[model samples]
Target: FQYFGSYYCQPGRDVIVHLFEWKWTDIERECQWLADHNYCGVQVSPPNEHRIVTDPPYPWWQRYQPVSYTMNSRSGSETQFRNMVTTCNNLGVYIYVDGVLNHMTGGGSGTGSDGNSFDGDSLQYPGVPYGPNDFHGSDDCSTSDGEIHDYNNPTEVRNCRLSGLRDLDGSANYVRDVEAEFANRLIGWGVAGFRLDACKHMWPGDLEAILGRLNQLNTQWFPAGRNAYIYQQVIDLGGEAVKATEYTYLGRVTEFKHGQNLGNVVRKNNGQRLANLVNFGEGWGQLSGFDALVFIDNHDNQRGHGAGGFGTILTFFEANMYKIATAFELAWDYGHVRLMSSYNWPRNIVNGVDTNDWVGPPTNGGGDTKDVECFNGEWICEHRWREMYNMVRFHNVAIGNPVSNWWDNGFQAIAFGRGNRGFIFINNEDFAITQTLQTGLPGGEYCDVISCDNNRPPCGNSGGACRATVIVNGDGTATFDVPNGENPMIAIHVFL
Candidate 1:
């Protein structure tokens, strides 16, 4: 029943790209490319003043330890952030700031990124004038350590600190007012919406109060009366006390199960089949497609931090399977999808725990993040990959169409068409499979967008990355020789 910003995207641009940990300068420069590629928006990392953890030498998670609403951030200065938002909005590439409103620093006294002093021990975050009274203390939590140990109890899960971070009492008027003001200020700066963090830790009604105070999207960039889009992070893969639907009434909620399930199935974990995904979404026990914000992997799971296990979550590290899952996600009619853009790090998973997971963004030392350079061995910009952006185009063209002419091999290979707009065949089979199937498109020569940069038959790419072309007959049937290896799929669209 809530409007989640589909109307604000420039016509035909429906997908969002999360530019994780990229500085404002790079994002501003990249917005032009996003606009050109029909991407709807960019989900930026938390831009508010947050704690600076030196022990881990500025781990990426430090940004989540929000200290205050000050505009100064590791991403950029207030002026630079405002400039990035305005420039992107003008290009029809909206900016959605990640809101870390659930808690503050993880039990320490330190100088925040913006020089704000925060004492997690005393619950004194003078940056927002949040005192001990504004947080969940002994009276609010039952645990002897004041940390969450029993997740089965929703009371402790919402009241206690997450990994020792100071939990904010979101129910209090003062907390709601401050957080709402932060959101409203960003809204006034032409920001499109927010990806609210750790929703399960905050009461839904309190979230409503905070969201209710938000103003309409800035009229200069968006149409009048547009509510800020909200998608809360709630990792509910069933068998949990706090259900994802608990927060759907507030707005769209992050479908963490989408990534895990898609990852597991794509990786063939426990022999999970691809054809089974033909009836995915709600039929697979997921949140309603309309209320779910989906992704193959997020910044958290990419590093093996969240519920997505090491073997279950696909990251840029697993380029082949990652692209397969992403292609399926974008092609299928499902939730509002977001793609992840990441930076390189020495990710070493030892016994399911990434030993080097705390490594920060590519840096020039002294906690300064380096500029983003796709494929430069530092910035793993999956959003810029040929297969990805082309699928982005495919997703754009296939909008307003439903699945039709589905054909599967009773196994890991499945083919389907999105009306007459586009058709895709996915193969996770162990060997090659060449089959003539109905694509449901007008007769024409179509290029394999998964391999080629162009959609037309010319299949032009100077680097010789282009692959085989398919000629559809008058009956809209084509032979697809989809292989059993890297980028092993064939996709064609009527836009050709």
Candidate 2:
């Protein structure tokens, strides 16, 4: 694949946040906040016009049903959307939209968010000027209903309807130009790139052709020659007919197995040793670091839609474990990371357990999403959590460093260094433990960014009492403790 953009982030900043369903006004404010805390960009909900579903009174998935390419959806209108992009891009924070290209509304008829009319039954979305010819032929799908049924059959997987949705004929030149035009408009608005929805359903060659026609990243927000950063959603959990590797040639592929494996090892009863994570990259069903996008949980798995399917992934529910897993993911050199910033969904349970997969974000009586307020007990804002955001800084400081001085307790406790730039220790055991571990850092007094941020120099902060500190000896060793208090892990990077 011919890679394009550089993730459209400033130096030393690499993490992006998926602010699912956040309004443009709120995203503009969040961009400033994220920049202050060192986040590189955000993946906002789809900005295009979509079907307005009312059966569940505004389910989040309605955003996945495209009625037109016009930027008028539940998130915001085109004016507000463009303003948010310009504002965020000006602040050195990039914005990536969730691009829905696979299909249109699955239902009979509806008016879209942009007041566009469409007859899904006839595959006539005049808003995008898509007619029956713009959709996949029924004969191309193997299932009787023309819906996707057999995962083993690549023909059915790529050509069939996904959950009754009208599949788009991406192979058609007309469709490619329409989709590319949509992407190009966003690029003109200073968007860094896209998180392609249901990319696995479209042939890579067709997707490549569309991408080839797109414009370069806006120079106002990116380097002169940078291309759009494309990361496609291809949920390959192994033993699948269509593998994630198929899409990497065009751009980075979402590594669902990364979340699955990390969640599996961090679950309390698994008895898995995180120490084995030394063999994390390829051994864990992952693409190369440069071609993979990793996350602990996403909009789909957190709500039981994709990969982890139901209970195999971790989310904000298990705060302690989730933070530990995320810290390890950032500390470990594997793939470009995307940190999930979620809203509360207490009733969206999975397999009779509280899984938060079915519930949408916090909304009002009219189903309009409520504004995000950190620590307001409404949104799950995991990215704002002390451990998660601070680790973003640690990851930035430790870039390009190889893992070194690895150590473990043969159980839930593990400690390792990122070359000489950072050191982290994680303890999943029920009890607290203390030990002297080799940090692989020069001698210094380091504050644990997990439980506490530095109150002094090198890492600039107003004077305040630190929750904990680590004293690294001249021999590149530190007396540290991974506790069972609020956070299960303690991290000390070169910057801290």
Candidate 3:
């Protein structure tokens, strides 16, 4: 039952990309590229009708606040949403909705994107028809402000509001039915799964009830007996009363520690060394690979929202280090990985807080999101990076293999292989380095996928940036002359 989090993807596909805030029309057009690149699915922004925040001029976070379960939002209308789902599902590129379940908008009265009226102060949402009886009142949360402050107490964490947002009574049958009905509606549209949000704030039993009411996957797309995939977001970094392990029996939980550890290692924070990751994942006290849904950085943490501290989580701002983290994440056998495709924001961090963090996607003028033309520099599509997609290929080809051929320089430089299927060398140390390591692969010439555009002989890339070919000797060893500058990694697989 816990393995309901099991992902359904095209055969041999292993990675999913978050096209954050991309509209349905743009996502429909991009599904073709996703299929070509061996991607499993897309984790899209919330499609439910949400509070229309215009004070900050349509900040991206507005999508997280639901007014109703209607299929209209800043992204697109229901027709476009359904069309995109059907089209992408046909291509084996499933859509995973960002399901927000814990709470509603902050104290306010506003009309939602679908023209649904909601008054948070009075606990009224007529679209879903939830009233004061459906939410937690002062009797439920003992906090003076009615907002979460004592996270050490599980009762406060679950019952209290998060930043003045209306806290819903998840234990109530009416609330459970409303949420399940919304999820089942998406399942009928052939949505493969959900990336549930605010899971840390909800009780496990409450979530279990909500999930139990979900119907099986759409028979038109999924085979009979298949369950709708469920991955709930629980940011458990230890020390909190709410353990991530508590919810694993329901489905997968987001492994926040995975990204935090990776970020610290890649940035060389503290005494952390890349060599220390020899025992990463469960060995590093993380959840088992089966229960973990991992990422380098999410839309929230990338902008310094939750667990990740400033300069700890790598973003496109730190492109070089970000690529290395992604490369290592892909090459290593860890968890179900997700990559972020973010839009460009003029980040102005003053005193550890990014003032521009709340800015929305690229827009024509008002709150309207623009059509994506990547590499225009407006859309920071990290999923489309040459190094990333190639490493995605590396991840896919070596899916069932275990880690082998481990070697490290006692510091920042490290090399490892996925059995004989693939091998990668990373040099985060200072100065140039050269070493011949056992690759455990058949002897042949291989392309350096990091700097190369293609993974074949010519190794084509713009500006002739592609490095020399790797020649694996008959003994399964190859010498790597990796520099300590930009894109300081080399990856080679059995295919090329």
Candidate 4:
């Protein structure tokens, strides 16, 4: 919306927002602000209805257990969702929905959520009007007692339910049609694509069939003849029954192990050096097919819930190291990444922040019960950080370029560029290390973005900072250094 960026982002690609547990109205406002700042898109939560939790109150994961295609979700109502898509699309900000198709909730004793009436005995969800016939028959699958227990056998893996959830019969034409209709509905609202949740629990052919049925991206919103981009969430953690390879034929698979492994080395908490990125996507079981959705942490694992715990966990503990690890991934040529966005707290607390009797939700007296206030609810908006946001614009415009003029000290400090488009360096060592690295950007006055401010009334303007200097010499390199205390990295992109 602001300005078209490099090859990666079609326009002013500075940052994207993952509106974690935000309402539709809040998303619209953020999209407008992001468009003003040159962001690519917003990664939204699952728009579909799912099981509701009252135990710890409703956790964000409750959305993972979809009840049906109706867009009445905890985040917003259906009308609000439709308005959000239209508004964001009009602003040239894309919306990516987290699609939950694996299984209905782990069918607990809890009542239904998202404005749905559920009948467990009849296996009926009146919101979508899905009855027992739409679910996968218990007898056909290889798993005993209708739950997926085998990882080596594809039949049992795909055909059975996940995490004690009810399994859907993807093979049934009725089920496929329903899924297609749900997808098409979102497509009509101008969504860019989907993050297929629990894909390992779904049969590959069934996923393809449903995706095939989905109408192509709405030509009115997107470019003519564009298909709805689909990526599967295959959490392959070594010995799992489902491998990312199985879904590679259908679409991109989540490369979980790679980041987990890399996080150890890059963070220096577990393994080696920054130079390991040179080896990149090898032996990690990442297949080349659909674009890979790469990230160091996600909603599932950051809270010690998903595969991310197996890799590296970041609890805003070492913020800078997390930034280096995440930014390096974005700069490196690997996959389309959806950064982890979250706000978390112990179960005993309210609003995911601190222990509170008054502030969280369901405000007792007449108070601000409907709106979200900062830290009032205990959210750490990681995407809001400057270094992370700046890279969004950098990567968007720098696609199709390769890291060049690579320079590194024997230690972990290193720097490289996307064919002179942009350059960045990181240090994970104990003491401050300064060195001159080859930065291919044209020799001119430039702001570093990591420390300095470039735009009018820079840094702290609208609560952001994008100003620092990198003097690119006539020789196409610069002397860049960060005292080990300030931050761990330095970056500058083409547009800045």
Candidate 5:
């Protein structure tokens, strides 16, 4: 039950791309591209009925304020959503929706994206017909305002409204039934799983009840009686009242510290120490390798809401370092990995001024989302980036291999072998290092996938050779170098 089981992808795909706020049609089109490049699936924005916020001009977080279970959201309508799921699933690209079951909208009254009316002031969402009786009671909350203020108090964290959002009474059988119905409906529509948003706000037993009621995934894509995948969002940073371990019994819990600590080690302003990453597993105060869902920068942390903050975490803004860190995440054996495919936001200054972080996706004045254009640089498609996708392919080829010949310079440089299938050399030092290191692989010429692919020219020759190749000596030792190039690391696997 704890296992993620089969990620419901084609034979050699494992990574899921969080296409936050992307339209269903665009996601469907990108599924073919993702499958061809060896991506497992997409972790889409909340596809349920959600509030239409105008205060911050339709901030992306508005989607998290769900109003009903109907598949009518800012992303697309139910018809469009269902068709996209079926289309992508047919090609072995599954969809894992960002499920918002903890609460309804914050204080406001308006029609949702699906034309469903909601009154946050009255705790009434007629689209789902959830009245005040369906919500948490103020008497049970310890806070004066019934809002979560004490992170040390699990009861308050679980029962109180989060940031004034109307909290639902998950203990109620009716609430669990509604949540289960929503998930079961998605499963029937070919969805593989759900990323339970704000899971810390609800009790574990409540979530278990909801999951227990969910039907098996659609037989069209999964075997009979196969459980739907579940990954909980639990931001535990050592001394939190609600630990990630509480939810691991149900499924994988988000290891926010994994990215936080890795980023702290990768950034130049920080120590920039890769050698410290040796034995970077449960020994380092992290969850067991199998129970954690890992990432470099998620939608929340990239924007400073969660563990990652400005300059503290590597993001698209820090392109080179972010690429290197992502490559390491894919190459290294860790928890279930998720790749963030973000939009070119605040970085794209308008009229010599940056936009607000809460601003929604590139949309017309009428609030309709524009199509995602990868080449135009509107969408930061890091998942499709040469280094990232190549590392993903490397991850697929190097699975089940253990770290064999580990080497480090006691500072920034480090090299390790994934059994005999793969080897990587990372140099974070200021100057280039040219030395022979044991690679733990059979002697052969390997294409450094970080810099090249099959269509590109060879690595050694000078006649427009775009690909960089590494020559392993007969005794499994090779002269490796880390230059002042954009990508500071060199990686090679058996498949390349």
Candidate 6:
């Protein structure tokens, strides 16, 4: 279940979730919550050393920079990180760390939150005890700025730094050994897999070598034969100098283009858009066969900080549309599905805030944050929306089946099935969309998760019967309505 491709719990069920910018303790709590909701696993943030920049008030991308492998960064200390893995695994939650192996910091000047000094210019890092000799020397990079400015040139892109970040010591055997040791350490502490960051800046051969040297999963946390799940972050939207295909040899390359195509569909650019997105890669010119970490928006793209900005589609508290978008992505076959769960911040850099809140503890000299809630000090908790979390149960139950009995109108009306395990439909037309479509479920009444079944602050029974109800007939067809621009989705998951 932790590997690159698909895994099955029963004959027809799967679950996937994203753990965005969440601390290790928060991750443990969320994992238990997900287990109750029947989720598969989690995609966590970068677990490496990074600069604690104060430029943007705890900006999310700080994790992209590397200092060492001490596991002490903004999120928590190494001990907290280890404990998080153990707790999550005990709760049956698989943790996939975002491995930022591309580059180190760009000669930044700052001491880490844990009091370790990292001088990016001198290439001096006392934490890892690395200096100029440990990095990819200036002569080795194909770019003048030492950053990867040339995309079309594979050698330049792979060997150079990205976004002014420091280049790792990719060529040296010692470099590979340290990186392998870091990953193996995580495995020993119970990490399930990794999400390779800035993979476009890394060569497939180098990645393979690093991954090949890594230790195996600790059998105590997983089955003896289970392999670490790996997803390469390859931001390929055609015409970009680098493409996801270049890194497919490394592991599961993130299908960024597929999410872009769905963004077009969700926006209703075409009349028969849902069908256009169904046979995803073929008609849309998007690749579908590769293993994928699919989502509408990531931390970088959602904030317009990454390469695939033009195609980003963030929910941002629009629960109805968020559900609709996921409905389309899940109903169709693209790759391994990963849901984006985030707290929304303003899209640009804001001035005068505690730009590096996570770097150091609060002014009171305490590290703990009390009651991490919705929109606390300019945070938009999109994951708190009922429309988004509803899909957790939907995805958990609808795994392992082909998208059968597909039906679609010109616009705002679409429905599909997964061999009787699950069925779903969405409508966004001007008038309410009413139709009798095949549900593939046994005759019975089932809940429309999106419209109702909200996981707002208080749990069940507090709000009685707020979810939508659907009746499936003996003929396996159900009549449903997608209210215009409102919550218009129906889904039912059958155990058999």
State the lDDT of candidate 4 residue by residue for 84-111, as single tens digits. Answer: 8898888878887888876676664444
User: Against the true structure, whose lDDT is highest?
Assistant: 3
| TM-scores for the candidates | 0.98, 0.95, 0.98, 0.86, 0.95, 0.87
* TM-score, cand. 4 vs. native: 0.86
- Tell me the lDDT of candidate 2: 0.84
Regions more than 4 Å wrong, model 4: 1-9, 12-16, 108-111, 141-145, 282-285, 307-311, 315-317, 347-370, 373-377, 455-468
Candidate 6, residue 345: how far the Cα is off, in Å: 1.9
Residue 433's lDDT within candidate 5 is 90
The lDDT of model 3 is 0.91
lDDT of 3 by residue, 1-496 (tens): 4357788887978799999999999999999999999999999999999998888889999998999999998899999999999999999899999999998888889999999999999999999989999999888999998999988999999999989989999999999999999999999999989999989899989988998888889978888878888888998889889999988888888899998999999999988999988888998999999999999999998898756457788888899999999999999998899999999998888888899899999998667899999989899899998889999999998899999999998999999999889999999988888999999888988889888876668778773689999999999999998999999999998772
Between candidates 1 and 4, the TM-score winner: 1
Worst 10 residues of 3 by lDDT: 454-463
Q: lDDT, candidate 4, residue 225?
A: 62
Candidate 4, residue 494: how far the Cα is off, in Å: 3.7
Question: Which pairs of residues clash in candidate 6, taking residues 3 or more apart in a chain or in different chains?
Answer: 57-355, 58-355, 107-120, 107-121, 344-380, 412-428, 452-467
Off by over 4 Å in 6: 1-13, 270-272, 281-283, 306-312, 348-371, 374-384, 454-468
For lDDT, candidate 2 versus 3, the one ahead is: 3
lDDT of 2 by residue, 1-496 (tens): 4575247678767899999889999999988889988888999999999988877678788899999999988888899998999998888889988999999989689899999998989889999899999999765776888898888888889999999899999999999999999999899889899999998799989988999998988887688878899999998987869999898878889998899889888874356777677678887757888889999999877766655455567888778778888999999998889999887766555474544344556788565788878778887788887778888888888888898898888877888989988888887777888889888899988877775655223433332434556788999878876667557787887763
Q: Against the true structure, what is every candidate's RMSD?
A: 1.3, 2.3, 1.2, 5.1, 2.8, 4.3
Candidate 3 regions with alpha-carbon error over 4 angstroms:
1-3
lDDT of 3 at 400: 90
Better of 1 and 5 by TM-score: 1
